Design a protein around this nucleic acid. Structure first.
Ligand SMILES: Nc1ccn([C@H]2C[C@H](O)[C@@H](COP(=O)(O)NP(=O)(O)OP(=O)(O)O)O2)c(=O)n1
Ligand SMILES: [Mg+2]
Ligand SMILES: [Mg+2]
Length: 427
DNA sequence: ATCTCACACT
DNA sequence: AGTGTGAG
């Protein structure tokens, strides 16, 4: 049977990313409790990134800054730039590009968010395993690596635990066997140290990293020892790792599916899924899910690292909650034109940098009284990077959503506007 | 109401 | 084509 040990995969995720970006530009904020907010004049603004000094006081994402200062009175704040009446994340997108290009020097990268990327190191490990003869792997090659599940068997501080575990790992390493999966992950972890040293040297940003045999495990491993540390999760660490791992913490199980696994099967931890046959899991959750759950609770997962460093979509949105929803026709025209103008400058930059053009425009709205994130999506042809054409066209395809008999009145008031360029192709 | 992106289902 | 889910 195939033990899900064919690959070496890392996930690298920046530490409190938006905060690091502001702290590098504004040294006043380094090594202090700070957070990043947007739109300051409602409850100090909503918090979108929290530094680790501020997390020690309880400050979280999604809190209002005014409530955040209640937990942490010395908290310093940085506010997202605002342009055309809405958030502008250019600074963070450009800092993201810095990190992704560096990681792209080492292996194939799958950009998975603005601050993290999966790395398929299988080939780079095979290559490294031949350039280093058969010589041992010194602990000095892994100065920030944790071996999950170690130390074991017959120090009271965290670095002491780290070293002892690493020591036990390396001492037990079969450097004889170029094919041993634990050796492979170790070499992968040496490379990830270098990758993270380069990221920090060249950008000033610290980050953490998971190393394992698949994307789900590498991501789990990444969070085990955040910040500024990397974690190797061997296939053999999985049974004890999963035996008390809440199901909701595994990637793609944090929502409705993970809740129904918990409710239907009557279990709390990943490891309890092993009691069920694959056909049982498939009866409850479908053939693809039951099969994915059957393999995943044994540490096995085959989703590949997609070679993709570039977004497939480029989107633009503003929500208009509560009293602020839009009820004029020309109010809806104006905000569409604001969204299309940011879209145009981002699309122009993308065409110049990446040699591709978006060919479809996706317009989406919500209306007060609805429930879900979106209430209505419609598409149209994107033939010119012209903000006025994009907004006019986007209006045309939604203007019948206006149930109002009136001319200039628009309602159910629009709680949300979303424009998204997509279906790119080479140019 | 703290703006984004990917993907499966149909 | 359009909806729903999951995520950072
Ligand atoms: N819901 C979210 C999640 C993240 N983000 C932005 C700001 C985050 O700093 C950046 C990366 O998100 P994140 O990786 O989930 N956690 P972030 O790096 O702050 O902190 P760590 O927990 O990763 O150290 O995405 C956001 O704007 N809205
Ligand atoms: Mg992060
Ligand atoms: Mg992240």
């Amino acid at each position: 049977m195939a033990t899900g040990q064919d690959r070496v995969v890392a996930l690298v995720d920046m530490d409190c990313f938006f905060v690091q970006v502001e702290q590098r530009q504004n040294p006043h904020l380094r090594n202090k409790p700070c957070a990043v907010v947007q739109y300051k004049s409602w409850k100090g603004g909503g918090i979108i990134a929290v530094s680790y000094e501020a997390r020690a006081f309880g400050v979280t994402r999604s809190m209002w800054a005014d409530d955040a200062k209640k937990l942490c009175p010395d908290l310093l704040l940085a506010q997202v730039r605002e342009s055309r009446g809405k958030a502008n994340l250019t600074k963070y997108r450009e800092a993201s590009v810095e990190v992704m290009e560096i990681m792209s020097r080492f292996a194939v990268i799958e950009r998975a968010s603005i601050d993290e990327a999966y790395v398929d190191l299988t080939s780079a490990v095979q290559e490294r395993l031949q350039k280093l003869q058969g010589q041992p792997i010194s602990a000095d090659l892994l100065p920030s690596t944790y071996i999950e599940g170690l130390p074991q068997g017959p120090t009271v501080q965290k670095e002491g635990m780290r070293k002892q575990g690493l020591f036990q790992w390396l001492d037990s390493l079969q450097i004889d066997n170029l094919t041993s999966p634990d050796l492979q992950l170790t070499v992968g972890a040496v490379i990830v140290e270098e990758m993270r040293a380069a990221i920090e040297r060249e950008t000033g940003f610290q980050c953490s990293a998971g190393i394992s045999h698949n994307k789900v495990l590498a991501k789990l491993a990444c969070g085990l020892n955040k910040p500024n540390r990397q974690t190797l999760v061997s296939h053999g660490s999985v049974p004890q790792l999963f035996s008390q791992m809440p199901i909701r913490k595994i990637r793609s199980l944090g929502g409705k599916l993970g809740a129904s696994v918990i409710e239907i099967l009557g279990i709390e931890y990943m490891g309890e899924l092993t009691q069920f046959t694959e056909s049982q899991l498939q009866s409850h959750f479908g053939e693809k899910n039951g099969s994915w759950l059957y393999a995943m609770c044994r540490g096995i997962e085959h989703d590949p690292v997609k070679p993709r460093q570039l977004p497939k979509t480029i989107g633009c949105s503003k929500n208009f909650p509560g009293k602020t929803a839009l009820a004029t026709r020309e109010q809806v025209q104006w905000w569409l034109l604001q969204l299309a103008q940011e879209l145009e400058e981002r699309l122009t930059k993308d065409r110049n940098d990446n040699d591709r053009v978006a060919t479809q425009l996706v317009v989406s709205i919500r209306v007060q009284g609805d429930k879900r994130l979106s209430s209505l999506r419609r598409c149209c042809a994107l033939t010119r990077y012209d903000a006025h054409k994009m907004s006019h066209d986007a209006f045309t395809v939604i203007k019948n959503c206006n149930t109002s008999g009136i001319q200039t009145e628009w309602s159910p008031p629009l709680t949300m506007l979303f424009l998204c360029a997509t279906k790119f192709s080479a140019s």
